[PDB]
Design an enzyme around this catalytic site. Structure first.
Site, PDB file in Angstrom:
ATOM      1  N   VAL A 197       0.837  -1.198   0.000  1.00 29.61           N
ATOM      2  CA  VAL A 197       0.000   0.000   0.000  1.00 29.61           C
ATOM      3  C   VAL A 197       0.873   1.250   0.000  1.00 29.61           C
ATOM      4  CG1 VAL A 197      -1.790  -1.247   1.369  1.00 29.61           C
ATOM      5  CG2 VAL A 197      -0.247   0.370   2.503  1.00 29.61           C
ATOM      6  N   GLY A 198       2.169   1.066   0.274  1.00 28.48           N
ATOM      7  CA  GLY A 198       3.144   2.162   0.399  1.00 28.48           C
ATOM      8  C   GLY A 198       3.888   2.167   1.739  1.00 28.48           C
ATOM      9  N   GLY A 240       8.964   2.759   7.009  1.00 30.18           N
ATOM     10  CA  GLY A 240       9.114   1.469   6.336  1.00 30.18           C
ATOM     11  C   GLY A 240       8.033   1.169   5.309  1.00 30.18           C
ATOM     12  N   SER A 241       8.133  -0.009   4.700  1.00 34.60           N
ATOM     13  CA  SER A 241       7.130  -0.464   3.757  1.00 34.60           C
ATOM     14  C   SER A 241       5.893  -0.885   4.524  1.00 34.60           C
ATOM     15  CB  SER A 241       7.688  -1.628   2.962  1.00 34.60           C
ATOM     16  OG  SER A 241       8.416  -1.149   1.845  1.00 34.60           O
ATOM     17  N   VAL A 242       4.721  -0.669   3.926  1.00 34.78           N
ATOM     18  CA  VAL A 242       3.445  -1.090   4.499  1.00 34.78           C
ATOM     19  C   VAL A 242       2.745  -2.132   3.602  1.00 34.78           C
ATOM     20  CG1 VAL A 242       1.210  -0.342   5.442  1.00 34.78           C
ATOM     21  CG2 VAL A 242       3.130   1.206   5.567  1.00 34.78           C
ATOM     22  N   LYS A 247       3.403  -2.796   9.111  1.00 35.25           N
ATOM     23  CA  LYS A 247       4.487  -1.934   8.710  1.00 35.25           C
ATOM     24  C   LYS A 247       5.776  -2.537   9.178  1.00 35.25           C
ATOM     25  CE  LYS A 247       6.707   2.062   9.740  1.00 35.25           C
ATOM     26  NZ  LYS A 247       6.892   3.400  10.445  1.00 35.25           N
ATOM     27  N   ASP A 286       0.465   9.127  12.520  1.00 37.88           N
ATOM     28  CA  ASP A 286       1.705   9.946  12.448  1.00 37.88           C
ATOM     29  C   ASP A 286       2.995   9.669  13.231  1.00 37.88           C
TER      30      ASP A 286
END
Ligand SMILES: CCCCCCCCO[C@@H]1O[C@H](CO)[C@@H](O)[C@H](O)[C@H]1O
Length: 329
Positions: free
Chosen positions: A26-27, A28-30, A45, A160
């Site tokens: 979906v976009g 560390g890497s997630v 994550k 956040d």
């Protein structure tokens, strides 16, 4: 200790309790995943370079301690945290699991024009989460529409811990920021919910500051009095001496209570900005406010923030925190 499995997504390996299935980037890497154990969609994550330097190792620890402490409806929390590593010696990777909230506030404002009632409720939930964050003596420092998750019921969580939502004093590296930098942010976000348009879409750093000054005006004598520096203090005088605008005239047609709240968030002088707790009692939120359902956080020990440790100290403490983790009910 559960069973782990291995898999490559994009160009990176993941090892996860087998209970976590259907991993999709979906976009560390997630990755989004389905939690076969609970039946709910999650975000997993993988922390980038957790222990690469001393600064990274301190940031990893900060990140975990923080997220471990966030227990509030309008704030992201940890469902889970795991490493594939047994023992500290092997320990090298940290994974955090939270709710997959499937739309953010940017996504919502682009498509839907929100009513007054919508903005009361959205901003109300932001301030509610914010009161709790601030009561732990934490500053978010990056509130923006994409850091706000929103569901079908238009219910909101702060994610956040761009520059369109940043308080002008951070942009000027003023130092010792106070908590009302987040209040500035909330003001920008609320203006944008009301109008459908970004309040301060600067192209760069100075542009950002330019657009801010046009809206709220050049500093008043009371504010200039507080500027230590002959440095900063001039240039300001030298600027085209701008009027503070009438917010009545900028946000024409908006609830006059919303307009009053905005004047109280979007003040240059951070000492004069309304706080999260005060804003919750503002008449704009009369429909949603409940002084007994706006809880504050447990005391947050952040003494670690002031200490300078070796990488292995930081990792071991991070390890303790992975081991100590109790999931929510
Ligand atoms: C862009 C032109 C100048 C911007 C003025 C920003 C003033 C912000 O407000 C300042 O916040 C500080 C915390 O950082 C406090 O110490 C000061 O007391 C307060 O005036």
């Amino acid at each position: 200790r559960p069973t782990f499995y291995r898999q490559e997504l994009n160009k990176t390996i993941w090892e996860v309790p087998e209970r976590y299935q259907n991993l999709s980037p979906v976009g560390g890497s997630v990755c989004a995943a389905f939690d076969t154990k609970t039946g709910l969609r999650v975000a997993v994550k993988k922390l980038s370079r957790p222990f690469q330097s001393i600064i990274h190792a301190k940031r990893t620890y900060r990140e975990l301690r923080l997220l471990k402490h966030m227990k509030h409806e309008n704030v992201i929390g940890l469902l889970d945290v795991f490493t594939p590593a047994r023992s500290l010696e092997e320990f090298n990777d940290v994974y955090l699991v939270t709710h997959l909230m499937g739309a953010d506030l940017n996504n919502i404002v682009k498509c839907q024009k929100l009513t007054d009632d919508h903005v009361q409720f959205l901003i109300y939930q932001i301030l509610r989460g914010l009161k709790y964050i601030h009561s732990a003596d934490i500053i978010h420092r990056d509130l923006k529409p994409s850091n706000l998750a929103v569901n079908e019921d238009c219910e909101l969580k702060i994610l956040d811990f761009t520059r369109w939502y940043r308080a002008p004093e951070i942009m000027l590296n003023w130092m010792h920021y106070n908590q009302t930098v987040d209040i500035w942010s909330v003001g920008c976000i609320m203006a944008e919910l009301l109008t459908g348009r970004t309040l301060f879409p600067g192209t760069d750093h100075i542009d950002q500051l330019k657009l801010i000054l046009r809206l709220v005006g050049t500093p008043g004598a009371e504010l200039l009095k507080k500027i230590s520096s002959e440095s900063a203090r001039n240039y300001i005088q030298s600027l085209t001496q701008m009027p503070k605008m009438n917010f009545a005239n900028v946000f024409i047609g908006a609830n006059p209570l919303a307009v009053d709240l905005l004047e109280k968030m979007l003040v240059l002088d951070s000492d004069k900005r309304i706080t999260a707790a005060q804003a919750l009692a503002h008449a704009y939120f009369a429909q949603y406010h409940d002084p007994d359902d706006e809880p504050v956080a447990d005391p947050y020990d952040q003494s670690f923030e002031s200490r300078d440790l070796l990488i292995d100290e930081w990792k071991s403490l991070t390890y303790d925190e992975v081991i100590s983790f109790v999931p929510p009910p």
